[PDB]
Design a protein around this nucleic acid. Structure first.
Ligand SMILES: CO[C@@H]1[C@H](O)[C@H](n2cnc3c(=O)nc(N)[nH]c32)O[C@H]1COP(=O)(O)OP(=O)(O)OP(=O)(O)O
Ligand SMILES: [Zn+2]
Ligand SMILES: [Zn+2]
Ligand SMILES: [Zn+2]
Lengths: 67, 49, 257, 48, 44
RNA sequence: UCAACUUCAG
């Protein structure tokens, strides 16, 4: 639903890298090159960003219960 | 490398990222125990479920 | 009949990484030092959360989980802080904990990214490794998150939120000479980065009298503790565990006498 | 123990209320067992 | 108590034994609104 | 509450 803080396998903080990853993808970088630029090295950490599905954006479309 | 002792495991081990699913069957929903609980009216035997 | 004298050579030292080599040491000692890196180095992390208002899409305990996983600078005061169990005061106090506050509302139309920067600490030494930022939640307009949190000292054996390190790379015998791992086809196997072999030779010749020594470590910090001080604190903590064990052992031996 | 005449039903045994319990819902209502309804039908026809 | 309206998201106070209809919108789905007492969550 | 139905588990 939202990018997890810390990769499950090792624990490196991946929560701060999702917006940068999306921006680098917008730039032109391939997924692998963006992952390298963000500093993700082990495939455990690259799985976190590469496989992430951001549903929080779809859930934010619904109006809040209390405004 | 063995986690407990640090020695290399002699047989090299197949590791990779595989997709796993968490099925709805969980132990907390299944654990049950009975000891002189409620009893049916007709049979006067322990209840079901 | 006595302990060997180990030697350390630090190859790389960066704000995020320490690559070092320990020579003339046992495999058990080396592995347990790595194990203490992972699980027995004290750190500061959020362990008490009280959410006054959470209208975000994520439920309260989801927010609490994410807050706990956020790293917090624990370089100096983690040694000064006491465990909550040790502290005499009831619940939590400045000596046993650090207080954080979050008061974010998305008044604007554009989505508000609540980050670790929005967490405000009562003591300046502990900050959420902000000096991007870890994203706690995204808030739509009209959605508000308010909470108070308390961060306590602890180590990774309790919970992975207290792990000071990301990945501890531990390698010994880079070229297989003790045959601790027996390759079915040695040539297919990639050379290690620490390997000194020529490209033609897949494995070093079997050393019958050899013993695992010259262990190579790469310790990556999570940012809470400096990677150097992770290793130093681990060595000191293992020594303290051994000394406590010796004290209790001496007491029980005296009792038996 | 068994005479052939006794096989023909001249007296119908009505089982005790233990055999045919009254199913109570919320105290608002008391459903009756299938046996109670069938016995009610038998009593009605017998009275007729 | 005070019930937040399902549609117009305006808090309305409805007494007991009173029909559940928000004033000014008429929606018939209300929500109880979060409790004042606070619950401690271990971040674990 | 009880009967019925369906869906699952091994
Ligand atoms: C091995 O035999 C068992 C038992 O006989 C018992 N059992 C299961 N279903 C039934 C049933 O409907 N009726 C009756 N009476 N017994 C039943 O289950 C059988 C196997 O079934 P399976 O073949 O699916 O076992 P996997 O080979 O599939 O095991 P995986 O790798 O998933 O763990
Ligand atoms: Zn990882
Ligand atoms: Zn205290
Ligand atoms: Zn309304």
């Amino acid at each position: 639903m939202i990018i997890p803080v810390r990769c499950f396998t090792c624990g490196k903080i991946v929560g701060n890298k999702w917006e940068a990853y999306l921006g680098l993808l917008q730039a032109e970088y391939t997924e692998g090159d963006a992952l390298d630029a963000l500093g993700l090295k082990r495939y455990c950490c690259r799985r976190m960003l590469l496989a992430h599905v951001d549903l929080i954006e779809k859930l934010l479309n619904y109006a809040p219960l209390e405004k | 490398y063995n986690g407990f002792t640090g020695r290399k495991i002699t047989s090299q081990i197949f590791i990779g990222p595989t997709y796993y699913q968490r099925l709805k069957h969980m132990v907390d929903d299944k654990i049950h125990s009975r000891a002189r609980g409620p009893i049916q009216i007709l049979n006067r035997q322990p209840m079901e479920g | 009949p006595y302990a060997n004298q180990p030697t350390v050579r630090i190859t790389e030292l960066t704000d995020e990484n320490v690559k070092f080599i320990i020579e003339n040491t046992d495999l058990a000692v080396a592995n347990s030092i790595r194990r203490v890196f992972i699980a027995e180095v004290p750190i500061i992390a959020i362990d008490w959360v009280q959410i006054d208002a959470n209208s975000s899409v994520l439920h309260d305990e989801f927010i609490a989980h994410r807050l706990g996983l956020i790293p917090l600078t624990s370089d100096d005061i983690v040694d000064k802080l006491q465990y909550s169990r040790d502290c005499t005061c009831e619940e939590f106090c400045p000596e046993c904990s650090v207080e954080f506050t979050l008061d974010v509302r998305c008044n604007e139309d554009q989505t508000r990214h609540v980050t670790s920067r929005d967490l405000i600490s009562n003591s300046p030494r502990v900050i959420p490794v902000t000096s991007d930022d870890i994203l706690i939640v995204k808030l739509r307009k009209g959605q508000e998150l308010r909470l108070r949190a308390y961060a306590k000292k602890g180590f990774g054996k309790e919970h992975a939120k207290w792990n000071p390190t990301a990945g501890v790379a531990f390698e010994y015998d880079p070229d297989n000479a003790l045959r601790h791992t027996v390759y079915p086809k040695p040539e297919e196997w990639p050379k290690s980065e620490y390997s000194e072999l020529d490209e033609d030779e897949s494995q070093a010749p079997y050393d019958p009298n050899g013993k695992p020594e010259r262990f190579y470590y790469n310790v990556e910090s999570c940012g809470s503790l400096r990677p150097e001080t992770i290793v130093l604190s681990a060595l000191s903590g293992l020594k303290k565990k051994l000394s406590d064990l010796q004290t209790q052992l001496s007491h029980e031996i005296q009792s038996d006498v | 123990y068994a005479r052939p005449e006794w096989m023909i039903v001249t007296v119908l045994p009505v089982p005790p209320l233990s055999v045919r319990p009254a199913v109570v819902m919320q105290g608002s209502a008391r459903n009756q067992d299938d046996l109670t309804h069938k016995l009610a039908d038998i009593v009605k026809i017998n009275n007729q | 108590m005070i019930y937040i309206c399902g549609e117009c998201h305006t808090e309305n106070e409805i007494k007991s034994r009173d029909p559940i209809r928000c004033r000014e919108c008429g929606y018939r789905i209300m929500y109880k609104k979060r409790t004042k007492r606070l619950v401690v969550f271990d971040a674990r």
